[PDB]
Every structure is written in structure tokens, then in C-alpha cells.
Amino acid sequence: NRDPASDQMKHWKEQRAAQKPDVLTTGGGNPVGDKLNSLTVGPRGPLLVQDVVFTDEMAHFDRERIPERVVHAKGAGAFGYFEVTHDITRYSKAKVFEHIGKRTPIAVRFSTVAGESGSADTVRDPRGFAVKFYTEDGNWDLVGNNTPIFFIRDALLFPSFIHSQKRNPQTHLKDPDMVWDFWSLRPESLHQVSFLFSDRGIPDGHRHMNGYGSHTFKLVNANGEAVYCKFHYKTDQGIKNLSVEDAARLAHEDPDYGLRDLFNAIATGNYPSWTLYIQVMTFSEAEIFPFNPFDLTKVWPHGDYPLIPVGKLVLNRNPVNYFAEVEQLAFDPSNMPPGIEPSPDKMLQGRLFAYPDTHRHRLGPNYLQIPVNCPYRARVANYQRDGPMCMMDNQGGAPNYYPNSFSAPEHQPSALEHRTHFSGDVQRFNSANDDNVTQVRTFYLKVLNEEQRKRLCENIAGHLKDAQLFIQKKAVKNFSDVHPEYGSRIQALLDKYNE
Amino acid sequence: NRDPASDQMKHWKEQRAAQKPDVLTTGGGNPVGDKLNSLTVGPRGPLLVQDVVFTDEMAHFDRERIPERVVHAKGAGAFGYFEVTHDITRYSKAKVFEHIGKRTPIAVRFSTVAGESGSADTVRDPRGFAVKFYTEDGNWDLVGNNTPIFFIRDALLFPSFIHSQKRNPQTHLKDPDMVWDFWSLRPESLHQVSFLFSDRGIPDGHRHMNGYGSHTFKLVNANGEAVYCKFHYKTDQGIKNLSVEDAARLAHEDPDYGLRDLFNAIATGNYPSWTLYIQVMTFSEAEIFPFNPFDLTKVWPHGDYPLIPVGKLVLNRNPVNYFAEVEQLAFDPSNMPPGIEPSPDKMLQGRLFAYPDTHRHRLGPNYLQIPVNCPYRARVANYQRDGPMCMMDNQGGAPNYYPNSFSAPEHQPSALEHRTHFSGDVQRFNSANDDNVTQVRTFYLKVLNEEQRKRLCENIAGHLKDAQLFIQKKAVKNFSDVHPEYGSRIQALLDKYNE
Amino acid sequence: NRDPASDQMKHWKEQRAAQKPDVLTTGGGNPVGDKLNSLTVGPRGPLLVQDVVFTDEMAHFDRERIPERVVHAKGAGAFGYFEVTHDITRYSKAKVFEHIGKRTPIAVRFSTVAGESGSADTVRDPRGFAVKFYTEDGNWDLVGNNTPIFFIRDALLFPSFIHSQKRNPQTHLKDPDMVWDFWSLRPESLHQVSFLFSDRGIPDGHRHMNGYGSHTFKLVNANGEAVYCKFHYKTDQGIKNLSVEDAARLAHEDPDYGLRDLFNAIATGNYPSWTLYIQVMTFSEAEIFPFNPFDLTKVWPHGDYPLIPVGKLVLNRNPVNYFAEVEQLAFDPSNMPPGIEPSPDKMLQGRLFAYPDTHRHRLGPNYLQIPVNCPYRARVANYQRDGPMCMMDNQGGAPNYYPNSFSAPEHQPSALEHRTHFSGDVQRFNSANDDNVTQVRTFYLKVLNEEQRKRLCENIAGHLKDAQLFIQKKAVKNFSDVHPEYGSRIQALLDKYNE
Amino acid sequence: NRDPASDQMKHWKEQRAAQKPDVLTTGGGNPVGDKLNSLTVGPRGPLLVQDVVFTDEMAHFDRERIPERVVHAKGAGAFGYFEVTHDITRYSKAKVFEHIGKRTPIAVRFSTVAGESGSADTVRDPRGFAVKFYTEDGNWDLVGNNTPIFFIRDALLFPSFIHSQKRNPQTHLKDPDMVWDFWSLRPESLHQVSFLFSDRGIPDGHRHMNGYGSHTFKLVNANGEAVYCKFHYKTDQGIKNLSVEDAARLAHEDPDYGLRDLFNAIATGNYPSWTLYIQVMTFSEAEIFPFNPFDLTKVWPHGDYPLIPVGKLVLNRNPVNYFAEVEQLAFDPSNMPPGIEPSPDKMLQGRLFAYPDTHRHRLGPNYLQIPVNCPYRARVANYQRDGPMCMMDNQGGAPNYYPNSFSAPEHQPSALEHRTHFSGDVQRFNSANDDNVTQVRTFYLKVLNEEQRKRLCENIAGHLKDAQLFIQKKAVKNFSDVHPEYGSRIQALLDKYNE
Numbered sequence A, B, C, D: 001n002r003d004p005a006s007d008q009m010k011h012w013k014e015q016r017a018a019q020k021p022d023v024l025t026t027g028g029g030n031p032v033g034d035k036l037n038s039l040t041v042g043p044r045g046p047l048l049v050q051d052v053v054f055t056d057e058m059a060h061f062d063r064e065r066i067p068e069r070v071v072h073a074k075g076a077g078a079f080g081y082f083e084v085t086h087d088i089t090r091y092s093k094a095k096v097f098e099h100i101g102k103r104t105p106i107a108v109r110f111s112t113v114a115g116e117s118g119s120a121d122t123v124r125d126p127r128g129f130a131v132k133f134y135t136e137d138g139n140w141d142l143v144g145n146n147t148p149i150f151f152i153r154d155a156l157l158f159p160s161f162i163h164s165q166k167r168n169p170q171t172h173l174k175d176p177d178m179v180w181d182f183w184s185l186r187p188e189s190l191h192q193v194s195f196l197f198s199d200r201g202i203p204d205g206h207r208h209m210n211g212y213g214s215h216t217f218k219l220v221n222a223n224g225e226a227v228y229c230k231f232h233y234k235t236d237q238g239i240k241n242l243s244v245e246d247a248a249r250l251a252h253e254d255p256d257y258g259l260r261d262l263f264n265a266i267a268t269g270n271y272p273s274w275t276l277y278i279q280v281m282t283f284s285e286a287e288i289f290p291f292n293p294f295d296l297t298k299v300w301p302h303g304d305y306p307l308i309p310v311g312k313l314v315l316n317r318n319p320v321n322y323f324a325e326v327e328q329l330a331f332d333p334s335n336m337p338p339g340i341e342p343s344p345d346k347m348l349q350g351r352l353f354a355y356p357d358t359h360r361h362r363l364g365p366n367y368l369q370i371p372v373n374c375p376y377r378a379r380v381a382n383y384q385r386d387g388p389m390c391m392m393d394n395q396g397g398a399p400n401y402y403p404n405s406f407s408a409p410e411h412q413p414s415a416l417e418h419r420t421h422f423s424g425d426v427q428r429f430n431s432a433n434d435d436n437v438t439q440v441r442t443f444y445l446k447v448l449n450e451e452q453r454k455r456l457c458e459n460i461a462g463h464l465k466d467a468q469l470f471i472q473k474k475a476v477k478n479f480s481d482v483h484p485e486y487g488s489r490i491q492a493l494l495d496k497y498n499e
């Protein structure tokens, strides 16, 4: 006998006891007489159109694939619940935080960023950690990563950043020139690049890394008072990372290391968990913060803004069918219930649009009707209708226009968003020159120790060495801006690689 | 007060009892606070991306439409049941005919042919009369028309025929030159054209016309014996047609005449019904038939092949949501349960491919998972997986390959198709001259009387007059081939027009 | 010999002189030996999968249709040019207005609003009048209507308004209750309703109606100075409308009356033209205008803001293939070149998102690559890549990320948008009660005369009579709010109708 | 200076030197002022819907991905020419073989089979080797592999086979139970499995392997005479394979080894070539062949059917944009010009349908209009029209129905397919027992030597050891049927593995 993941089929068979196998049918439900031999004219004659068993099956096979996620294509999913352990109702009226002991079902998907569906799990890259809470007030999607920050601070640079991390448009090869030219030209990336090339760049599976909302969000209480916050979900299994050596080995040995690690852990009752915390910053404090409180390349020092306990995230259920439950999972940062709102963070603002948008393309206009994406703990009632692949009853014969005099769904003023005053010109304000080095300096010499600083520089050099010399120079200049030694150590390694 | 159709909303509100209106939500289930005013900075300021209530709703509105059916786009639907009244098990082992009194739920869609979704119901055109039987052996789709024959006998001419009946590729206008150039060049169309321009060309609604499978089909019994057949479902409401004058009036007064007529008939309890019959031809008989038994431009004389009663079709339920239940309805001639099979009819053979093919395009790869199309009376089990908008559980974790040693779905030898012998070279046999006038002559001279013939010729000439003279001549020549008087009567009217 | 439209094919043939017919091929370019007879085993045998001539052609036929436009589905198109006749460079720096005599190619599509693709042209409804200018600074899409105003003033009510003007979700029938319940609940619609039910509700074809941008826009000159404007393009053919009786008759005699009239006019050299004017309002004046200058239900009095001539629009070319050049035509209000920008108009703001969004759905992600939609007079260069149906070279091997050090495209500061100042809270400001009667009263009493008011009320009553009494009462109540007589005249007709 | 592939951007910049960078525009051609900072109200304010530069770019990014190929997803492409070297016009009248020295442009795509888009190039798996010939008689697609045979002989087993080779439905992990359960239950796979697990299972890049049509095809000469044939294209750069150890290290060091190798070879002028040969078998010989001459699990012995030289395939041009020219490449086995036809091979018959079908889904209905897929050396002219993303002029105003009296395209009888006679009942003939070992014995004992035979068993055991014992037993049983020592050697290693 072997690991549970390996015995997937064996277990499916034994669980079907002595039940006779079902009758094999066409998509239309017609029993099939023989699905192993095609309908031909004579033993060695041509195939007939009349063989609709063949066409029915082949036509479906021909349409099995859907486009992969534009980013975070390689991933793993699991399900479980969220449980409130502490009272934060003074900050947010969100039903999900309603009362201690309150449980809400959740869906989670882990993933890498740049690699396609067939890529390896154990590679250096940020890690997606999206959590879907099916609440009474609809779904709340906390689409986070294994890092509290990111490489850029304005959504207009996202497509270009992703492109630079992907393949060359002509050769279809990973291109260090594209990678470092972009990062060297955009030093705001220094903070996350430092995180990326540290030990945390390659977590050991998905159970040994933390999750972060990254962005500054807004919480609103029952009295309509608002504060800004940040979400943190620390792994209860402890932080564990893979060495560059073992990561590379597993890259070919088991491209799906993260997938099987998670499935087996849950299958054996070793359910992984995370503790959800929040940091709170009042509007007054946000106006005095030394940097842009809504700058995604910045963190909120824990000493000034301590973590507040909220609850626990537990994954105790594996998907039964990956494609249906994980490949089709759709997380939308715009999916926020009353009590939780976005901040003016330029990046988050862009994500408000991008996710539902790419989902309408990747899955389809009615992707929210796919079981895993349905807010099944809520009652979806509105004036939206039709669209391709419309399931259910399309809200039946209910009046489809609002307002109406026929008792159809009514909006609820209780759900109105919190109001903030803004004053300024409609312009494209430059954020390229906000502080790009201060917090990186503290990360380098305060957060990391001597051994991980050495590893950090070797990891960077090992990749930067493949870029052109003028790019290497520019990149080293930025690192030096953070700290002379940071750049010096990298430069020293580059001179070696450069023979 | 008013007719049931007009009081649709009034009724929905009443059936709603005095319930409180549901809370209006986004597609994600999030309650909306005010869905009548957009989120802006200041009363006369710009719209925010932050307004996700707006985007959610507008994006779905922007995707409401799907491609209309390439043909038969304008239609009406209803639901009911098929009840067996006679025993024909000696001919077919199909479970649908299993025992007297057995009822099978059905779905039916009526339609015109050439017009697009916004066209009028009361126009001269054949009428679609598709019936979906949800049987224990899967769905059986009998996709018939209100005529036992058709204009052509080879599917390769179908796209061209339809193009000729639709809009000119440049002007987007109906084109009599296209219509008659095609018909005059393909005389095999004379039989259906005669029927089309007779009074039956414009039935009074959908309840006063007969239905026909048109094609010759094959029935197989428990002993594996087979016979050919024709399906006939006669209106119990009686044949009734609209005069050209009334149809033209209704065309603008109520372009949805047929839709309204059917909804109200059912809503008032005046359920329309049809009596299903079959004609049976043994294989020996098919070998001696004066024409090709599988030629779609010909009928089987009732005198030589008497109608055998089978059961009744009753429509007693209106759709609740038209888009979900009627617009998305998909009938596939290839959906046939054991006991019912196709004949060599070249046209039918082409249809075996065409419908599932167009449905995967118009609806989606997984169109059979749409509620109204699901064979909900059968257990769908096979090795098909994934595809866009994959609902349910995608068959969970069941082994997905066949054969397998894990108890997944299995054949069913009894379902094997009836084996027939065919001999001959594989080539394109010309069927253009398979007698295009004999049966047309009997229709013109015996089926119709004097006043009917006069109207028939007046209807033809009224439309053919707009074609070029050379086309008029070629058309008249064909009619003359059916009968000299047929031609001269039309010619005399044409001369009066060409004045 | 008939009209040009009727002789479309006749002319195509004559055009090919003695030139020999092309060889008929498959989509893959393989010559076809016989496209009239399918490949079978014996003259009365089954169809073979081997007949790839059949499958290739049928598979395409099965995919001919695309989703029709969610609104304005029924239309006609033509091409021509825009010629500058006056200098307005003091207001806008747009290249399209660069110098007197400058010509810019244009594409125009006329249409109704509610009817689907098969509906009739001569029905009461607003008329779409979209103009695409292919300028050196990209495409400028002025998506106007034949009216200066609209039914609503906030985009959140648009889907609802459209739903109310379309078919009942259960019966699929036009619904007077839906139409009037919505309008009676939203009095802001009074202005456009009065316009819609006046003689201008049914123009005589597309050449005898004016065009308007409707919304207030912003013009920016070379010195960075800005002013608000309104676009007006008056028909040089004169205003001409159809009587209700003639329109009803044509509804069935020629559903494509508008299409035919436009094609023949151009084919005979009787090219239609419109004179383009603009109204100008300074930011100072906008500050004290009696109404919200960005309220789409309001017009700017010509007495206070006279029309300033700009140029002429002339249509002198008929499309060659309707599907490729008209059905696939896509206009995005967001397509605005430097010198032209949007105003705060909530409705216009919503349209900035909706059109490109619906186009990605209806046509495809790369719909801007469809020839008629390509900004062929500009050099498209950016960092966008891939997507389905990617044509041309997909920008070859050019660096695909910005910024870069490899000489790829650069943004141009001179194209920066004009900066406007805004201040206020972020909230949903109610605009439901922004004076819904003042201008309506002026229209009713001044713009119209006794004869015109008589028909107006008869037209309204003729439709409103089919709504429930409680809806009729509320509707009449709003009309009385405009003017007592407006409501009483309608009420008198209603009483007669209700018996 | 590095390899050409690495200097892709460097070179693009240089070859553009002496040119000012282009203006960065939106998709609509509107120049952008600042594509690096989003439009907000105030420096730290909300993102505006008015930022259409952002929406236009992000919306396109959100739609960059299309479904990957259902199989053969990971690949590399290149272009070149086919040059005739010998005269085979006695066998085929195809224009592509017309005269010695004649050149026809070609497009080629190499690939693995099971892995997704992000998978490694150097893994054990068959290799795709598809060639598209742009001939004057349309495109001819020779969709070959690097092996002359395949695992199964009936298309109905293909989807199951591919499913067994891919990921487990629930775990999403490679599953040896699925792999070997299928192969052990279907011993016809022994021949190809033996080839797969031999040294040829992991080619050193794409230049050091052969290509085969695999299937028996049919050639028809100018006199209407036909013969059956096999296509063979041998590498001119010699057969070379990767050791299991080196392929494994390359899997993580360079997962795109094959792409890189091909691009650099061509970039440096080391153009790879292959010699195209054919084997000929007369209809008489096919009647007495010791096996089914159309059985894909069989080869035609060279001794009895020697290879006849035809021409050379030379690749001398790299793609300029991978996505447009390679990812979108579509090869349809059904694309065959006059002189080349299919054989009764059950697998080929199925492929005639599957490729165009999957292409309509993966790429779109009009995928043949994508530049790289267009039969640009031919003249496409037919009666097909419209469909989404319709490019070109959609054949303008040409009559769209056939037959017609207006001089539109006509079929050419000389292109009629060769006629063949087939006798026997039309039914599903079992082919599961068509000698599964005879040629496998020859391969094992005669083709391979002791060393490679040793590695063969080690390779099989290394993978088979992960399957359940009952599956191992059945698998070994099959190998023993080929030759007791074959199964014996594997069982020995298996025992050591099972420890």
C-alpha cells in the first residue's frame, strides 16, 4: 500500500462496494453498446458519420481545455472553514466576524506566478494564497500572496511586469534581460525582490508559508466608523523553505510537489491551519504615516501597528474533481461584504476591475454560476439575466427591471459604503519616486541575518549574471542605494560569474 | 382584466403572496445599498472604478446575448408529456413506447425558418416542430417540421439553400433573385415549394398544424428485427391557416402572434395536443418502392402505408423563463435511444453531425448540462470530462479512461445498433434527377382543388415577379414540367405583373 | 430593371466581365471536385466521415452567427468622409479639425434600439447614429442618436430601462406594464418620452433625421485651455417623418425600408450629408447653468449657446459585405483623440466602460483588429499582445514590457489629459429629482403646436392604454406635472380606450 | 555576446537603430500621455473609470490566453521549404511533387505529447512533427510523429489513452496506475511502448529525430490509378538521443532545451533538414499483407517495401512572434490536395474529424484566416461566410449560394476523389486482437541490440514499479507474450524495486 494520493483510484473502487458499474452513455444519456470499436463499412473500411458515439465523445474531448489563468496558472486547491476566535466587531460589522465560534466555509487555492500549467511547483516565485469565504452577505474573496508587499505600486505597470517575468515574445524562452531591465528601471521593486530572493522565495509546499492581504483595506463598523487595516494569516505549521538545491531536484523529480503534499496532508487527517490577524491604522494615523499608507511596496511596522487576533483558517477537505473545483475557481477582490471595503491603493483599485474581467473571459460570462464560485450561503437576487451557459432558472419570471411595482428585489441602504472626502485634480500623479529604499534597508540589515544576506546576494547574482552588463550595472546601482554592502556583495559575485 | 400573458408580472407578484422583497445583491451575493445612483466624487464628479455594483451589473448586461440559431431563430416553446395509447413494441423496443399509458415528459419548440429573432411569426415559411422526449434511455429528439418533405435531398446543398432564403451578402435585404435562382436551378424543390406556397404556408399559430419527422427512420425491436418508418403527429385542434391578408396585417400588429397564442392557450387550460402515428415500411418493401424511400422530397402514400397510432403529445406547461428554457433549448437528431435509429437518408445523415456541432458553438461545449437539455431521466455516466462552464461534479474522481480495472461505467451490448448490409463503391452519387415532378403532379392535381391552385399560383407569382426575367422563365419551365397548366397559370400572372 | 439594391448580383456578375469563375475550394484551399453530392457507400448508403468537403462547409455554416448587439441590433451602414469647413482650433487641438478642407474617412451605422436583428425599421424608437472617424491620432467614435437627450441620467438604470423596453422574461412578449411601470416610476424620462412619441419618433429612413452626441463633452486646445461642448450634425436632406399608418404598413411591406433607402440613395449618387456644429459652454458658465450641464435629460438652449459650424459628413460608399463591414462594426465612446475628452456626465462615464466591454464579448478580445474597426490611419504601437484570433504579426519581436531600454514605443506627454479639479465625498448622490419637468413643459408648449400635441397624446395613449390602471394613473400624474393639459388630454383618450 | 536566442532584444534594438521609437497608443490608436501612472482624483485618491488607457490595456492583458492544445501542448516552431529531388509523379499527381527542384513553403511544429504548456522538453514521450505545405492546391498538412506507429488502432480509444497519460481527475498528479492499467488492458500498445521506452524515447532536441506520417495514406496519379503509401522523413543531422540522466537534469536546468536548440541552429545558419521518402504498396499487395496494412500498430518492412526518395525539408527561418506563428498554428490531417487521400486506417479516419473540430474551439471558427494558417499560395473561393472574427472582405458581395447563375466559384471534377469499393456489413468490428506481438518480437530481438534492450527493460521497470502489483503482473504477462526474456528481465528489476 502507498500514499493516499497514489491510491486515489484504488479507494474510489473499494468505496463503490459491490455496486454494479453504471451504464456507459453518450452525453445525451443514450446507452452505448460498444465504445471500443468504431462503426465502419466492413472490417477494413471507412468510418461512418452515423457513429454518433464516436463524435459525441471526440467532440467533447476536443473541447476539454479552457485558457489557463493569465498569471498563477500552476496551483493547488483545498476546502475547509474559517472560525472566529476573537471579537473585532468594533472595527468591522462584517457578518463573517459576527461572533466568537462563528464558522464560515472557505475555498483556497495556492499557486506560483509566472509558470504555465505544466511548470514545476518548487521554483523561486511569489505564492498565491487566495481565500474565498462563503458568507451570508455573499462571497468575500481575500486574494492574497505569501508576501505582504509587491514589486510595483501602480496597476498600469502590472501587464508589463508580468510580461517581463514570462517568455520572450519571439523565442518563447525565459529572458533575464527582460526580467532585470524592468526591475532595474523600476527600483520600487527592490523591497519585494529582496523578499523573493531570500529563503522565503521557495516555500516547502503550501502549508509552511504565511498568507497576506498585502493591500491596505478598509473596515467599517455598525456605527459607520472606519479604519484602515491589513490582513495577515500566519501558518500554524511553521515557516519552512526548500534550499535552492532541493528545489531544483524536486523541479524534475516531482513537478507537482506542492500538489501532492497538500492532498496527502489533508487525506491523512493532518489538516493545515493559519491564524488570521489584522493590523489597524486610523484615518488620522494614515495621514501622518511616513510613507503612502496605501503603497503596496510598503509594510506597516508591527511595533507601531501590532497584529490583532481574529480567527482560524482550517483546510480539511480535498477537492473531488480538480478541474471542476480548482481549475474553475474564481476569486474577485471586488467580492467584499458590508463591513469590508477597499482603500485608495492604486494597485488594489486596478484589481477591482481585472479579476471579474479576466474571469468572464477564462471561464465565461456566467462563471459565478459554477458551483465552486456560487455564493451558496447567500441568496442571489437581482436584475441580471441571460448570458451564455445560463444555469438554474435564470431567476424565473421575476420582474427584470428596477425600480418596479411588483415586489422584486430591493436594495438595502444598510449596505451603503462608507464615505471619504477627496479633493484634487483629475491627473496621473507620479508615484515612481516615492521612497524605494528605506524599508528595504531595514529588511536587509535588520530582518535578515548574516547567513541569509549572503544567500540573498548569491541567489540574486545567480540570476542577474545572465543579463547584459549595462543591466547588471543599473541593477547593482539600485541595490547600492539600499545599502553599499548590498550592492557590493552582489557585484562581487557578478564579477566571478562574468569570469 | 386581460389575457394571462399580459398579466404575467401581476401574477408573479400575487403568487409572491405578501413576502418581503428579497435583498438585491451583486452576482457575488453582496447586498447592494443603492442600485440607482453611481459612485462619484462629489455630485457632479467622475465615476469610480470602485463602483463594483455598476461594473458587476453592466458587465453582465453587456454579455446577455448569445448567437441566435443559424436557422429557425424565431420561435416559441412549451412543455408537456407524451402518452402511449397503442402498442407498437412489435416494431420498436424503445423504452419510450414500453407500455400503454406510459408518459414521458417532453419539451417542444415551434418556429419559422428564415427570419431572425425579431422577425414576425405570421410569414410564409415552413414551421419547425421539434420534440424532446426525456426517456430513461436518454433523450430522444424528434426534430420535425410542419411538412413531411423538404426542398432538397442532399445536405451539401443545405447551407446554400439557407443562404438563398436569407439576406443578400451586400445589401442585407431579402433577395428574390437568390431565392428563385436557387429553386429554378434545383427542381427537386418543386414538391416542398408547392406545399410552401399553398395555404399551409402560413398556419394560424402553432396549434393548428401537423408535425412530421419528415425523414425515414429505423425502428428495431427486442428480437433485433428492423423496419423503416415515418413519424406523423397530427393536430387535434385541426388544420387552420391565415389568409395572406390577415398574416400581413398580423405581421405588424403582432409579430409574436404565435408566441402569444400558445402561451394563452396553455395558461387558460386549453392544452393543445397531437396524435402520434407512424408509417411502417419493411426492408423488402423499401427495395421495391417506386422512388428512393430515403428521398426527403418524397412522401410514402398513405394508401400503401397506413398510419399506425402510437400515442399523444400534450403541452400543458409554459416556460417560466424563456431564455433559459426556450432560447437555450437544443434538439439533436442524433439523440436516439435503443430501438430508434437513422436511415440512409442523405439529409438526415448530415443532420446527425450538424446539430451537436452548432450547439457546441451557439451554447457551449457543455450545452447538454444546461437544465432544459439535460437527460434528467437518465443517469449520465461516461469518460467525458471538463470543458468550459463545467457544472455539477464533473463526475467526481471516477476513473476517466476506458477500459479500466476500477469499476467505472461499462458498455451494454444490448444497446448495439442494428447491423445493416451495404454494398457499392464509395463515391458521390448524383441524386439531382431522382424524379422531381411525379409526386408534385399529384399534389397540384389531386391534393388541391381549383380555388387552392389559383391561390397557390397567385402566391408564387406574387413573389417570383421580382426575380429577373431569365429566372422567371427557368422557374416557369420547371412548374410546366410538373403540369403545363401549373406553368401557364403562373406565367399569365407574371405577364400581368411584368406590365 | 429595378433599383440598385435589387440588381446587386446582376451587377457583380457584369463586373467580372469575361473573367472565368474561380475554382471552388475548401477553407484550406483544396479544390472541390463535386460540392453537390455527398460521399456515401452506395447510392442509398450512409455518409462517410471521409467527406471532409461536407464537414468543412457545414461546420462553418454552423458557426456563421455571432451575438447581435445587446441594443441597437437592427441597423444599416455606409462609409464616406468628414470635411472641415470652419476653424474651431481655438476650442480643440484634435487633428481631425486641424485645417479647413481636411478630410477624414468615416464609417457610420444607423439603427433602431429595442428590436432584434429581424425587426422592422419603421417602428417608433430612438435612432442610433454612430460615426467612426479614422484620424491620425487614432479612431474617434462619436456614438450619437437622433435625439439630443435620453430617458435617464445615471448609468445604473440603463440595463433596467433596456429590459423594460424589451421582452417579458417569461412570455417573450413586448410588455406595456414593463414599459410604463418603469417610465412612471422614473419621471426623468419625461423629456425623451415626449420626443419619442412626437412625429420624430419615426423618421423617414436614416437620411431625414439629425444626429447628436447628446452628452456634454470636453474640448481642449493647444494651450491647454478647455471648454465643454455639444455635438450636433443636422441633416442636409431635411427632417422628414413617417405617419403612424405609413410606418405600420411599411413594417410588413418592407421591414428593411431604412436599409434599402440608404443603399439606393448612395448607389444612385444621391449621397446623404449632415452639417456638424458644436455648442460651447465655458467652465464658468457650466458653474451657473440653471440645470446640471451634464444632465443627459437636458438640452442647452440654442438662444444662449448658438451652433458653431465645423464641417460636413458625407456618405458616398455602400458596404461591400454587410457582415464584415456593418454587423462587426464597433464604436467605443472611449475612442477619443487628444483635444476631445469626456465630461462628468454620469451616463457618458458609464458608456466609457460598457462599449469596449460588450465588444470583447460580441466580437472578441481582438475586435479592434477586424478591418473596419482598425485605426488604419494611425500607427498602433504598444505593449499589448496575443489573445484569440491574433492577426498581423502581433507586433513581431518588439520588447513587450514598459519601460524598457530597447527602443520600443514611448508615451507622449503632449497627449496628457486636461486636468480638472474635483472635491467632495465619495458617495452615491441621488439625481432622481433633478428637475424632470421644466424643459419638458417648454417642449410641449413651444417646440410643438396644437396639431403636433394632438398626435403626441394619441400616440402615448395608444400604447399606454394596454398597461394596468394603476400604472396609467401614475403615468398621467407625471404628464400633468409637466402641464395639466398634457395629462388631461392623455387621460381623455385613455378613458375612451378603457371604454 | 551570448547565443542568438539570448540576444533577441539586443538585436531588435540594433536593427531598429537610427529610428525614433514609435508613439505608444491605445488599441484604438489614440496616443497615450503617461502609461506609467493611473488617473486618480488627487495623489492618493480613487481610480477613475475615465482612465480608458488603463482599461484598454488591462482588458487585453486579461484576455491574452487561449486554450492550449488538448495534446502536444508544449512545442517549438520554424519555417522553411520543401524541395522536390526525385520524380514520384507516377504515384501522385499532387502539385507539390510536380517537378524536380520545385519548392513549396513549409511551416513545422515539434512537440511532446502529455505535458502542458509549461512542461519540460526533455522527458520520455512521443514527439510531434507536423508539417504544413502551402501548395497551389491548398495546404497539405502532414501531421506526423517521430515514430511510424502508435499505441492504439481505433480512434474510440484515443481520448481514454490521452486521459490515462495525463493527470488523475481528483489529485491532478501523474498516475502510473492509470498509465499501466490502460496499457496492460490494451496489449496492442506493446509495439509503440517498446519504441517509447527505448533510446528513441528522448530525442536530443528536435533536429536529431525522424518524422513519420505513421498512417497508410493513398496516392493518386494523373491517370486515376492509386497506391497506398507511408511517409518517412529522415533527419540529415543524424539520430541522437539524450541519456535518462542528462534529460532529467535538463528538465530543470532548461525546460525549453528543444526550443532553444532549434532557434539557435537556424539563427546561426545551421539549417536542419530531413529527407522525405515514401513506401508504396499496391492495392493487390495490400490484399495479401500478413497484417492489416491500415493497422497503426504495424509497420511495412523495408525489405519488402523499400523507401523511395521524394525531396528535402529544410527549416531556415525562425518565427518572429511565437504566439502568432506557433501557438496559433493549426494542422488538419484532412487538408489534402488532389493526388493525396486518406486510407481506411481507423485512427486516421477519426483524425479527419478531430483536428478541424478542436481548432474551431481552441482558435475560433475562422482559424483558417489566421495568417500562418491561411493557404496563401492558393486562392480560397467558396460559399462559406461570416462567423466570429471574420477578417478580409468575407468574399465581398459574391453570390453566396451554389449552384447559381451569377458566375461565382465552380467545382473542378478533376479534383474528384479516387473511388474505392468496400464490402461487408456496417458494424463495429473488433480489432483488439489484430496480432499484438509479432512485430514487437522483431523489434525486441532484431532491431535492438543487447545494450539498448537492457536499457529498454530498465526504463519500463523504472516507471511500471509505481503501479499496483496486479497491474504490474498483467503488464509483465504481455511483455512475456512478446518474448519470455522480455517479460523476465522486467520482472527481475520490478522485484528489486518492490524490495
Ligand code: HEM
Pocket (backbone or CB within 6 Å): A062, D068, D069, D070, D071, D072, D075, D109, D110, D111, D127, D128, D129, D130, D143, D144, D145, D150, D154, D155, D156, D158, D212, D213, D214, D215, D329, D330, D331, D346, D347, D348, D350, D351, D354, D355, D358, D359, D362
Ligand atoms: C485517433 C487518433 C488521434 C486523434 C483523435 C488526435 C487528436 C489530436 C488533437 C485534438 C490534437 C490537438 C490539435 C490542436 O489543438 O492543434 C492533436 C495534436 C497532434 N497530434 Fe494527434 N490525434 C490522434 C493521433 C495522432 C497520431 C497517430 C499522430 C501522428 C501520426 C498525431 C500527431 C499529432 C501532432 C503532431 C499534433 C500536434 C500538432 C501541432 O503541433 O499543432 N496524433 N491530436
